[model samples]
Target: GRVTNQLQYLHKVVMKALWKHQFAWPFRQPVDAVKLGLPDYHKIIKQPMDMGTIKRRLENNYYWAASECMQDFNTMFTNCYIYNKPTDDIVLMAQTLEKIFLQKVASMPQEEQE
Candidate 1:
């Protein structure tokens, strides 16, 4: 259901492009992939469709965030270095919310995996 909702939102946002096009001020095309020390974008585009890789990447991200936050409370503190204490509290709340989000993501229906 969540993935369906996300796909619906994406479809709503990205309609068909015909002859008309909208241009932004700062547009820079990649001249050479090697210049950025990055692989061709096409090469990795399909990786997310691979469930194992997606799961691994998500878990890795969760582990890294948890580890960094545990290493120093200041790490989390500096991430949202806001003037108001309530804002900082909200930011910390988001960290826990992220965990709940990951739980829901992992619990998504089998057909929705990846």
Candidate 2:
């Protein structure tokens, strides 16, 4: 359930459109500014992409995607209530889940290290 390549492409397109519209609009009132999070469009548009924010968003999406993928894998590959007697396919799927979890955890900041 990782975003399909198609969906990722669409997301980029939509974000670009949003950025364009937001840049074109003039400040009309306080509410308009508040809705824009009071961000200085000039500064934000000039600033490089925020990698930390992007990383956190990707981590959240991956967690949801992996959870959904595991649920599908379980439905397709396992019998109800079985534990140790999993098929090779189920083992591989579980390993995939472990890898996803580890990757997400690794994206956490070192200040969060334990």
Candidate 3:
């Protein structure tokens, strides 16, 4: 298997090697979570997932366009328009790090979880 997808998400690739990598950046993606013991009961009673679920159910998750009511810690994640999407190199470093880390975690041989 000439697996070349490795370059795209490996631990030290184009993203981590960029000259802009000198700075620090953070990132986030929309998701369905239950911080309200489910945060859905008190609202207008809805926020749909397919809207951000990559409705096609595609693998290009980990990021999405604008969504609703994603809040936690001391920050909230809603914005008003498309241009608001981030593309700075520093941020890419963070995203790549997370993607690579998640890849590493998922590849570890699991013993099985109950």
Candidate 4:
């Protein structure tokens, strides 16, 4: 399959690559506030994000630019930092994934026009 918008295409590719990482499991799904017994989660993380939601947004064409998707990725990691301690396993994994994300974005294919 092919898409005209290279930016969206690359955004999706980078996100898929992140999901394949072993450390990605903890951030795969939305953080369950009640099930995790953390009632204050919602109040602290107002715009909570995760890989699953990012995938859905990409498939739905919700992002207007690649930078917008990048912003969401940053938001996801920032939420982790705000809610979890630096030594927490989830936070550690998120840190790894964020580094990977940064490199991937930096290596995106250059834009071309017909």
Candidate 5:
């Protein structure tokens, strides 16, 4: 119970950093398939994800382990890469934020898990 609580806290800390990042705006909310006019988004990207959903899931304790939470973070970025062109601005933005996320996770206090 204690270790899980600490992991949840770490997730909140990392998410806060991600939300404040400049590139985070585009991923802050779910993609509007109709508004963005991408009909094949759901078809191709079967597992869609976004920052808002991650935050909500964290608050609801939907994750059983730290790795589960980490998966969603990567999923959000992976969806970006899948749906957007490689040269598109959103793709690079997602790439930058994904790098920052990994860095933040790696830099946390090592003993917090126990």
Candidate 6:
């Protein structure tokens, strides 16, 4: 149900971190940046981790360490996806699409069976 929202949120958290090191690329596109979290060239003056880019990022007036971890993981993973072996890249993309397709089929209403 709402789990997809949480997972997509997870996607954004990782995407933003990659945005920090001037390597946001594929992850920093509009959906990942403008749609989910912060986006502004001006926000760049401040470090991504210490961003004043959005109020949500500040819990109790401080950035969360756990939140930072999500960003770091996404950044690191992004580098691998871009530069890793072709086989690793190929397998993951294929498998993940298959997985998502399977889940979608499993969840569709069963009216067709009638």
All candidates: CA RMSD (Å): 15.0, 20.4, 14.1, 2.9, 2.1, 14.3
Candidate 1 structure, TM-score to reference: 0.25
Q: What is the C-alpha RMSD, rounded to one decimal, of candidate 3?
A: 14.1
Q: Give me the candidate number with maximum TM-score.
A: 5
Using all chains and alpha carbons, the TM-scores for the candidates as numbered come to 0.25, 0.24, 0.24, 0.86, 0.88, 0.23
Every candidate's lDDT: 0.30, 0.33, 0.30, 0.80, 0.82, 0.36
Model 5 CA lDDT for position 32? 85
Candidate 5 clashes: the total is 0
lDDT of 1 by residue, 1-114 (tens): 123432322122211110011321111121234764546433643211221222333334432332222223222223323322565454554345334434443433343222
Task: Encode model 5's per-residue lDDT on 36-76: one tens digit a residue.
Answer: 88999889899889989988877776776777878888888
Candidate that scores best on lDDT:
5
lDDT, candidate 3, residue 67? 18
Residue 73, candidate 3: Cα error in Å is 14
Q: In model 5, which regions exceed 4 Å deviation?
A: 1-6, 111-114
Candidates 3 and 6 compared: the better one by TM-score is 3
| Cα-based lDDT at residue 92, candidate 1 | 55
Candidate 1 root-mean-square deviation in Å: 15.0
Candidate 6 residue runs with Cα over 4 Å from true position: 1-86
After superposition, the stretches of candidate 4 with alpha carbons farther than 4 Å from their true spots are 1-6, 112-114
Local accuracy of candidate 2 as per-residue lDDT tens digits, 1-114: 255432232234322332243321221111133465645433433322221333344445552343333333233223211322356343554345334434443442333111
Clashing pairs in 2: none
Candidate 1 yields a Cα-based lDDT of: 0.30
